Design a protein around this ligand. Structure first.
Ligand SMILES: COc1cc2c(cc1OS(N)(=O)=O)CC[C@@H]1[C@@H]2CC[C@]2(C)[C@@H](CC#N)CC[C@@H]12
Ligand SMILES: [Zn+2]
Length: 258
């Protein structure tokens, strides 16, 4: 009976195994655009994915991860609210069963069809495992997805999902360029938070872009064909793998734009 997104193991149950679920800096949160304040101390955000090296794609039973080789400083995120260099290690999405839900963060309570999470770890901590044990160990770039025009750069991902339909399945996924998943603008909101799934560690500096990318209905439909279950088990469609907004508590969401 391990955690999941169902009625008996979903988000409202996570606190029993992971008490931090009711912590002081949990994610995701609702972003109140009118309360978020422009922060002049924020430095220009730097997203350098030109030398990114993807290696494989995995269905871990909660979502699917496109993993990158982070043994060297290649695809990095810096600037903005960040101090130091954060290395890209993987990206994944959270989506819904319907176009009107799926995102973890919400903007003025509005839910998007999905949300992309590009995960990076602070290099001063040596490795990803050590980084997650630090308040400023990770930096996750969140990008909303809305249904409309197809996103050309996402099709490569969409077409390989049939090969990793069930939990535990992985497939080679080299030479995928994450720059093809970024919107035009880098305007963003930032706040201190946590991982959005167990163990819910409060080690993340969240940077959520204001501009969403558009993906086609067909593209998101394929996301919904994935399975939460492993091969040979009753089919449980991988949909609604998002955690709802959590209490903001003693935090302020800062905006990079005036
Ligand atoms: C930032 O990316 C994630 C990392 C992890 C999880 C979920 C994540 O998605 S999210 N929405 O971006 O928070 C869930 C499982 C976690 C893992 C991070 C590394 C952890 C803490 C392992 C420890 C190491 N290394 C144990 C469980 C792992
Ligand atoms: Zn995530």
């Amino acid at each position: 009976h391990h955690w999941g997104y169902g009625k008996h193991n979903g988000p409202e149950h996570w606190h029993k195994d992971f008490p931090i679920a009711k912590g002081e800096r949990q994610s995701p949160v609702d972003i109140d655009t009118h309360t978020a304040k422009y922060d002049p101390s924020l430095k220009p955000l730097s997203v350098s994915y030109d030398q990114a090296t993807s290696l494989r794609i995995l269905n871990n039973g909660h979502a699917f991860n496109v993993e990158f080789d982070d043994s060297q400083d290649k695809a990095v995120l810096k600037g903005g609210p960040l101090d130091g260099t954060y290395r890209l290690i993987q990206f994944h999405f959270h989506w819904g069963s319907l176009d009107g839900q799926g995102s973890e963060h919400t903007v003025d309570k509005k839910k998007y069809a999905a949300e992309l999470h590009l995960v990076h770890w602070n290099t001063k901590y040596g490795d990803f495992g050590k980084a997650v044990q630090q308040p400023d160990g990770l930096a996750v770039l969140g990008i909303f997805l809305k249904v409309g025009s197809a996103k050309p750069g996402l099709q490569k991902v969409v077409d390989v999902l049939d090969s990793i339909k069930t939990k535990g399945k992985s497939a080679d996924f080299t030479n995928f360029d994450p720059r093809g998943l970024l919107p035009e603008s880098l305007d963003y909101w930032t706040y201190p938070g946590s991982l959005t799934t167990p163990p819910l560690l409060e080690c993340v500096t969240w940077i959520v872009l204001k501009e969403p990318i558009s993906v086609s209905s067909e593209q998101v439909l394929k996301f919904r064909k994935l399975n939460f279950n492993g091969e040979g088990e009753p089919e449980e469609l991988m949909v609604d793998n998002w955690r709802p907004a959590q209490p903001l508590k003693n935090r302020q969401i800062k905006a990079s734009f005036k």
